Amino acid sequence: AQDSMIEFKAPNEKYAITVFTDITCGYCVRLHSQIKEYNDLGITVRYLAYPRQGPQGQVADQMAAIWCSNDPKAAMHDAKVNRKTITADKDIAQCQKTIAQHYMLGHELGISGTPAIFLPNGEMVGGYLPAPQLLQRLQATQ
């Protein structure tokens, strides 16, 4: 559950967000291209998979290969910012279960689009926000 996330830990973290993402979403790519901006403002980003196709389509298999790569952080970047095909380095059957569990969690929480950003207090941002505006949203809520 809370142990199958891909975490971009921010030095001197002041806030931590949970992001349901989809590698095919143009704004999830925009969000991932700004991870350094998030960390520089003290925002830790933790990724959860949510293929809008569904937990068994071709997007879920690509995100399963990301979670099953020897370096999932580099696999996420090559898939989002570079549109490169990711091949699983470990048994993809392990990660296909994780992707399906991540989708079931996002469906349980009731998200309706990606990226789904959850704040520490539980509130949700309905899409991508740059690091400055996201920091302002966190300071106003947390």
Q: Which residues bind Cl ion (CB under 5 A)?
A: 7, 54, 56-57
Nearer to Cl ion, 37 or 61 (CB): 61
Taking the complex as a whole, how short is the minimal distance between the CB of residue 100 and Cl ion, in angstroms?
A: 10
Instruction: Identify the burial level of 76 via C-beta atoms within 10 angstroms of its C-beta, where 0-12 means exposed, 13-18 middle and 19 or more buried.
Output: buried
- Of 57 and 113, which has the nearer Cβ to Cl ion? 57
C-alpha 77/C-alpha 14 separation (Å) is: 24
In the complex, least distance from residue 48 CB atom to Cl ion, rounded to whole angstroms: 12
The radius of gyration of the chain's CA atoms, rounded to the nearest angstrom, is: 14
Q: Which is nearer to Cl ion, 94 or 139 (CB)?
A: 94
Q: Give the nearest residue (CB) to Cl ion.
A: 54
Pairing of strands 43-49, 15-21: parallel
Choice between 54 and 113, CB closer to Cl ion: 54
**Under 8 Å between Cβ of 118 and 124:** yes
CB of 138 to Cl ion, least distance (A): 22
Catalytic residues: 22, 25, 28, 52
Helix locations, the chain, DSSP H: 26-32, 35-40, 58-67, 72-80, 92-109, 131-141
Burial of 108: CB neighbours in 10 Å, binned 0-12, 13-18, 19+: exposed
Q: How far is the CB of 16 from Cl ion (least distance, A)?
A: 13
